[PDB]
Amino acid sequence: MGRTVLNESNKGLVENFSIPAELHERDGKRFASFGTTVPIHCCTPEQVAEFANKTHHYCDVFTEQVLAPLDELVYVRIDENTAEKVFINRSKRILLVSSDGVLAQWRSAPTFESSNRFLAGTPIVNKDGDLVSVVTARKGNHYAVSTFEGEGGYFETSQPWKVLDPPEGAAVYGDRWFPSREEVRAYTLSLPGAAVSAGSPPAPVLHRGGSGRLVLADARGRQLSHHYLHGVATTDVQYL
Amino acid sequence: MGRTVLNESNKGLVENFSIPAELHERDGKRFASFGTTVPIHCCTPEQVAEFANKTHHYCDVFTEQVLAPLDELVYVRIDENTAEKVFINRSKRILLVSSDGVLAQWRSAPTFESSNRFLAGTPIVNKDGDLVSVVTARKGNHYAVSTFEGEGGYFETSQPWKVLDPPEGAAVYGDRWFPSREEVRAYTLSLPGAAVSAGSPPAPVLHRGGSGRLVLADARGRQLSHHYLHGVATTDVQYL
Ligand SMILES: Nc1nc(=O)c2ncn([C@@H]3O[C@H](CO)[C@@H](O)[C@H]3OP(=O)(O)OC[C@H]3O[C@@H](n4cnc5c(N)ncnc54)[C@H](O)[C@@H]3OP(=O)(O)O)c2[nH]1
Ligand SMILES: Nc1nc(=O)c2ncn([C@@H]3O[C@H](CO)[C@@H](O)[C@H]3OP(=O)(O)OC[C@H]3O[C@@H](n4cnc5c(N)ncnc54)[C@H](O)[C@@H]3OP(=O)(O)O)c2[nH]1
């Protein structure tokens, strides 16, 4: 079955629309590809290392080619012969993160709402069938469309992400969090000057919550960058 | 003359509203203060060094007090006995930057539209007269309201900001810009790994333009962070 969706019966605006795709199963993971194009989180460390150098940089997407711009509506592949028509929502955003050993990418991505359960890697195309993005992560019924558009960036480091959930109202610093802001400064006094080298590269950190945060820290927990996220969902983001 | 505005005749919705302020003149520059609270860019390097430790961290604002939240309307001081009522616009945004020798702050700030020409430092208050912010920068008729609200962050470094204006469509990396993505890759290969120490702290870089960018770089221009700005104006931001 060349079906890129888990549920047996289709849901939503379905239309006849052939979009090629390839299916893979490794251990218990099942994912889809679009030629060379795969989600970064669906690759073995061997696959990640070989693709890091030959790829364009989209969050959690490996691809040897530039993706088409987004516009107002896209089609998501259901079968070899059918696809789902969905509006792109630039007001409901999801935060993506990824690492390929070279760049720790992040993106405040737009979404579309489907009640289907698409495989990671499912192709997303425009009216002309040009690949605009690939299914990566989902929060509820909202799937993240990783693209150039929207707020985004990347950290130059080999280190993977640290994904943390600080308690509500805590004063975040580095990979740590503290109950009071004064204690933050106390901990600030005890640390040395920030140190980065080839030996000890920086550490990317994502703090999920109501006050979401993107932080870059050195090996010792000293902060290099701190970024207050707004308008983006961070909690319960599932990588399919 | 206790006027916090340059133009001789008031414009806009003027209301009776007494707001304390002090006027200062250094060289040919004239700005206002609110007790301790002043704009960072209005300070001598000696004044900056003294306030860095005694301050709360708002972009281009020094203050010994926590700022009141941003409601929907604010009042801006014209003279000792009158002030202007202006609507706060969260959809037309301006990018702010500042440095105090400890934090290189940036902020996507909301704006208000006045035809008055306010001094830097003019107090901005809510209905209760609580200090909500201070006049810092403006683009055209749109003044930036520096607050906690909105997207923002800071870099830990002593270095000042580096402000560049790359040509349209160029591929930005670090402090340089290149014609295509390919040249960035070539330039990437010739560089060592980023090096940061107490001796060589990071460099904050702002790239203004259509695709505005926030970058953290080592002393030699190797990139540590890269951030694609969206939804904020960067080009004609004037620090009053
Ligand atoms: N600056 C800022 N921008 C925001 O958008 C924001 N949204 C919420 N809050 C919270 O309001 C309370 C007021 O402090 C804090 O609890 C704060 O949450 P937090 O963000 O968790 O706190 C970390 C402290 O820690 C501060 N530091 C970070 N680095 C340093 C440093 N090298 N030296 C001294 N202080 C440092 C950091 O600026 C800060 O303290 P200050 O605001 O007083 O400056 C914000 N604070
Ligand atoms: N990734 C990305 N996100 C965006 O939001 C975006 N908006 C516009 N563009 C431009 O589209 C063309 C696509 O290439 C580029 O001209 C690009 O302009 P730029 O974004 O201004 O140039 C930086 C190049 O340079 C890349 N690099 C950055 N650091 C490295 C590094 N260590 N090693 C290899 N490449 C690095 C950076 O990823 C990139 O190259 P990629 O094509 O691979 O994305 C974007 N690119």
Residues with CB under 6 A from ligand 1: A 171-173, 181, 184-185, 188, 223, 228; B 56-57, 102, 148, 152, 156
CA B117 to mean position of chain CA atoms: 17
Q: Which token pair is B198?
A: 């107490």
Which residue has the least CA distance to atom 45 on ligand 1?
Answer: B148
Residues, chain A, total?
A: 240
Specify the DSSP element, H or E, that contains A227: strand A223-228
Specify the DSSP element, H or E, that contains A123: strand A123-125
Backbone angles phi and psi of A124, in degrees to 5: -120, 125
Reported resolution, Å: 2.9
Q: Judged by CB atoms within 8 Å, which residues 143-172 of B form the interface with A?
A: 150-156
Cβ atoms A200, A209 nearer than 8 A? no
Q: Are strands B203-207 and B162-164 parallel, antiparallel or unpaired?
A: parallel
Per DSSP, B49 falls in state H
A150/B225 Cβ within 8 A: no
| First-to-final CA distance of chain B | 19
Residues of A within 8 A of B224 (CB-CB) are 155-156, 196, 202, 216, 224-225
* Closest-CA distance of chain B to residue A225, Å: 5
Q: How far is the CA of A225 from the CAs of A190, A203, B215, B217, in angstroms?
A: 18, 11, 10, 11
Cβ atoms B97, B105 nearer than 8 A? yes
Q: How far is the CA of A149 from the CAs of B68, B129, B178, in angstroms?
A: 33, 40, 21
Q: Which token pair is B47?
A: 């004044």
Cβ atoms B238, B197 nearer than 8 A? no
Q: Which token pair is B48?
A: 């900056």
B214 → chain A, closest CA residue: A153
| First-to-final CA distance of chain A | 19
Q: Which token pair is A198?
A: 């080839």
Q: Three-class SS string for B57-96?
A: CECCEECCCCCCCCCCEEEEECCCCEEEEEECEEEEEEEE
Assess B49–A contact: CB distance below 8 Å, yes or no.
no
CA B170 / ligand 2 centre spacing (Å): 10
Q: How far apart are CA B151 and CA B95, in angstroms?
A: 10
Q: How far apart are CA A14 and CA A77, in angstroms?
A: 10
Candidates B9, B240, B11, B234; CA nearest to B113 is B11
Q: Are strands A232-233 and A89-99 parallel, antiparallel or unpaired?
A: parallel
Candidates B131, B115, B126; CA nearest to B6 is B115
Candidates B170, B143, B154; CA nearest to B204 is B154
B195/A153 Cβ within 8 A: no
Q: Amino acid letter at B166?
A: P
CA B65 / ligand 1 centre spacing (Å): 13
Q: How far is the CA of B230 from the CAs of A60, A150, A157, in angstroms?
A: 20, 6, 24
Q: Three-class SS string for B198-221?
A: CCCCCEEEEECCCCCEEEEECCCC
Q: Is the CB of A156 under 6 A from ligand 2?
A: yes
Q: How far apart are CA B155 and CA B52, in angstroms?
A: 14
For tokens 């007090």, the residue is B65
Nearest to B230 among A151, A154, A202 (CB): A151
Count how many Cα atoms sit within 13 Å of the Cα of residue B165 in the half-sphere of its side chain.
Answer: 4
Count how many Cα atoms sit within 13 Å of the Cα of residue B33 in the half-sphere of its side chain.
Answer: 16
Cβ atoms B38, B46 nearer than 8 A? no
Q: Amino acid letter at A190?
A: S
Q: How far apart are CA B87 and CA A147, in angstroms?
A: 34
Per DSSP, A5 falls in state B
- The structural domains of chain B, with segments of one domain joined by +, span 14-155, 159-239
Assess A212–B contact: CB distance below 8 Å, yes or no.
no
Backbone angles phi and psi of B68, in degrees to 5: -70, 150
Residues of A within 8 A of B194 (CB-CB) are 156, 196
Count other Cβ atoms within 10 Å, centred on residue A158.
15
